[PDB]
Enzyme design. Structure first.
Site, mmCIF file in Angstrom:
data_model
loop_
_atom_site.group_PDB
_atom_site.id
_atom_site.type_symbol
_atom_site.label_atom_id
_atom_site.label_comp_id
_atom_site.label_asym_id
_atom_site.label_seq_id
_atom_site.Cartn_x
_atom_site.Cartn_y
_atom_site.Cartn_z
ATOM 1 N N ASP A 1 0.779 -1.243 0.000
ATOM 2 C CA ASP A 1 0.000 0.000 0.000
ATOM 3 C C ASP A 1 0.816 1.302 0.000
ATOM 4 O O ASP A 1 0.217 2.375 0.187
ATOM 5 C CB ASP A 1 -1.081 0.034 1.123
ATOM 6 C CG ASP A 1 -0.520 -0.091 2.505
ATOM 7 O OD1 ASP A 1 0.717 0.246 2.665
ATOM 8 O OD2 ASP A 1 -1.329 -0.405 3.409
ATOM 9 N N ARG B 1 0.814 6.741 0.020
ATOM 10 C CA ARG B 1 0.031 5.765 0.770
ATOM 11 C C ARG B 1 -1.360 5.713 0.174
ATOM 12 O O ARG B 1 -2.045 6.704 -0.004
ATOM 13 C CB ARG B 1 0.013 6.165 2.239
ATOM 14 C CG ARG B 1 -0.860 5.324 3.126
ATOM 15 C CD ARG B 1 -0.353 3.891 3.245
ATOM 16 N NE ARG B 1 -1.009 3.116 4.304
ATOM 17 C CZ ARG B 1 -2.204 2.551 4.194
ATOM 18 N NH1 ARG B 1 -2.898 2.614 3.074
ATOM 19 N NH2 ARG B 1 -2.671 1.845 5.214
ATOM 20 N N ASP C 1 -5.793 -1.117 3.639
ATOM 21 C CA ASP C 1 -4.666 -1.543 4.485
ATOM 22 C C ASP C 1 -4.228 -2.871 3.985
ATOM 23 O O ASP C 1 -4.991 -3.843 4.061
ATOM 24 C CB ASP C 1 -5.090 -1.576 5.962
ATOM 25 C CG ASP C 1 -3.891 -1.728 6.929
ATOM 26 O OD1 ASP C 1 -2.848 -1.228 6.547
ATOM 27 O OD2 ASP C 1 -4.155 -2.360 7.983
ATOM 28 N N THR C 2 -3.019 -2.940 3.463
ATOM 29 C CA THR C 2 -2.395 -4.206 3.175
ATOM 30 C C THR C 2 -1.649 -4.702 4.416
ATOM 31 O O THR C 2 -1.185 -3.941 5.210
ATOM 32 C CB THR C 2 -1.432 -4.109 1.993
ATOM 33 O OG1 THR C 2 -0.515 -3.028 2.123
ATOM 34 C CG2 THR C 2 -2.132 -3.898 0.681
ATOM 35 N N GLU D 1 1.576 -5.786 6.508
ATOM 36 C CA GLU D 1 3.011 -5.478 6.449
ATOM 37 C C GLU D 1 3.732 -6.659 5.791
ATOM 38 O O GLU D 1 3.225 -7.790 5.812
ATOM 39 C CB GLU D 1 3.583 -5.206 7.817
ATOM 40 C CG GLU D 1 2.920 -4.063 8.542
ATOM 41 C CD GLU D 1 2.978 -2.763 7.754
ATOM 42 O OE1 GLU D 1 4.030 -2.434 7.196
ATOM 43 O OE2 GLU D 1 1.927 -1.970 7.711
ATOM 44 N N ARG E 1 3.515 11.379 3.609
ATOM 45 C CA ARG E 1 3.129 10.580 2.467
ATOM 46 C C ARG E 1 1.940 11.155 1.752
ATOM 47 O O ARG E 1 1.019 11.626 2.407
ATOM 48 C CB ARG E 1 2.750 9.130 2.930
ATOM 49 C CG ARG E 1 3.855 8.461 3.666
ATOM 50 C CD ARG E 1 3.546 7.055 4.114
ATOM 51 N NE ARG E 1 2.445 7.025 5.065
ATOM 52 C CZ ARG E 1 1.895 5.932 5.586
ATOM 53 N NH1 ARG E 1 2.432 4.737 5.369
ATOM 54 N NH2 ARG E 1 0.825 6.026 6.343
HETATM 55 C C1 LIG Z 1 -4.322 5.568 4.761
HETATM 56 C C2 LIG Z 1 -4.095 6.673 5.824
HETATM 57 C C3 LIG Z 1 -3.207 6.504 6.860
HETATM 58 N N1 LIG Z 1 -2.989 7.514 7.759
HETATM 59 C C4 LIG Z 1 -2.145 7.277 8.995
HETATM 60 C C5 LIG Z 1 -2.999 6.646 10.083
HETATM 61 C C6 LIG Z 1 -2.045 5.631 10.712
HETATM 62 O O1 LIG Z 1 -1.337 6.350 11.797
HETATM 63 P P1 LIG Z 1 -0.395 5.528 12.805
HETATM 64 O O2 LIG Z 1 0.916 5.411 12.100
HETATM 65 O O3 LIG Z 1 -0.304 6.488 13.988
HETATM 66 O O4 LIG Z 1 -1.002 4.190 13.117
HETATM 67 C C7 LIG Z 1 -1.088 5.286 9.601
HETATM 68 C C8 LIG Z 1 -1.475 3.980 8.990
HETATM 69 O O5 LIG Z 1 -0.607 3.746 7.831
HETATM 70 P P2 LIG Z 1 0.141 2.355 7.561
HETATM 71 O O6 LIG Z 1 -0.945 1.276 7.407
HETATM 72 O O7 LIG Z 1 0.923 2.618 6.331
HETATM 73 O O8 LIG Z 1 0.991 2.044 8.836
HETATM 74 O O9 LIG Z 1 -1.149 6.358 8.668
HETATM 75 C C9 LIG Z 1 -3.663 8.695 7.645
HETATM 76 O O10 LIG Z 1 -3.489 9.621 8.533
HETATM 77 N N2 LIG Z 1 -4.480 8.924 6.626
HETATM 78 C C10 LIG Z 1 -4.747 7.918 5.698
HETATM 79 O O11 LIG Z 1 -5.593 8.194 4.863
HETATM 80 CA CA LIG Z 2 -0.226 -1.362 5.905
#
Ligand SMILES: Cc1cn([C@H]2C[C@H](OP(=O)(O)O)[C@@H](COP(=O)(O)O)O2)c(=O)[nH]c1=O
Ligand SMILES: [Ca+2]
Length: 129
Positions: free
Chosen positions: A15, A29, A34-35, A37, A75
């Site tokens: 993702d 991103r 959510d993929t 890890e 991102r």
């Molecule tokens: C997809 C997405 C993720 N995020 C943030 C929330 C999550 O915060 P936290 O890092 O505090 O958990 C994280 C999840 O991304 P990842 O799944 O890439 O880890 O990115 C956003 O703020 N907006 C979005 O639209």
């Molecule tokens: Ca992920």
């Protein structure tokens, strides 16, 4: 919403993908998914799915939603298309991502993705197996 050009720099994981956008490197991103890890079950398969899709594409496009365009890590938050096919949707349809991270105001393709998810779940594909 509208699609805008980008060119692939590097596939990262299921993702996240790095593209050149408006002439600058940006890690994107994917919205609304959510993929797993890479170190989790189906994570390598999601990574490989996304990599193949963006690497084989003649034309990458980025589509921002109505809200936030970058997250707190810097991102880009977008829907990514490979020769007109949305990566985000394709991952969900294949049971390689869950619909997730649905924040109000950046949720234009939510129902499209949830429909994909339902069909992946009926098919018992991958994550749903
Ligand atoms: C997809 C997405 C993720 N995020 C943030 C929330 C999550 O915060 P936290 O890092 O505090 O958990 C994280 C999840 O991304 P990842 O799944 O890439 O880890 O990115 C956003 O703020 N907006 C979005 O639209
Ligand atoms: Ca992920």
């Amino acid at each position: 919403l509208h699609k805008e050009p980008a060119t692939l720099i590097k596939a990262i994981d299921g993702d996240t993908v790095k593209h050149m956008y408006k002439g600058q490197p940006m890690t994107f991103r994917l919205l609304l998914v959510d993929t797993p890890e890479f170190n989790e079950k189906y994570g390598p398969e999601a990574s490989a799915f996304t990599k193949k899709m963006v690497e084989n594409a003649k034309k990458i496009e980025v589509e921002f939603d109505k809200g936030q365009r970058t997250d707190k890590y810097g991102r880009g938050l977008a829907y990514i298309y490979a020769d007109g096919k949305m990566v985000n949707e394709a991952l969900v349809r294949q049971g390689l991502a869950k619909v997730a991270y649905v924040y109000k105001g950046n949720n234009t393709h939510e129902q499209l993705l949830r429909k994909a998810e339902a069909q992946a779940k009926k098919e018992k594909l991958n994550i749903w197996s």
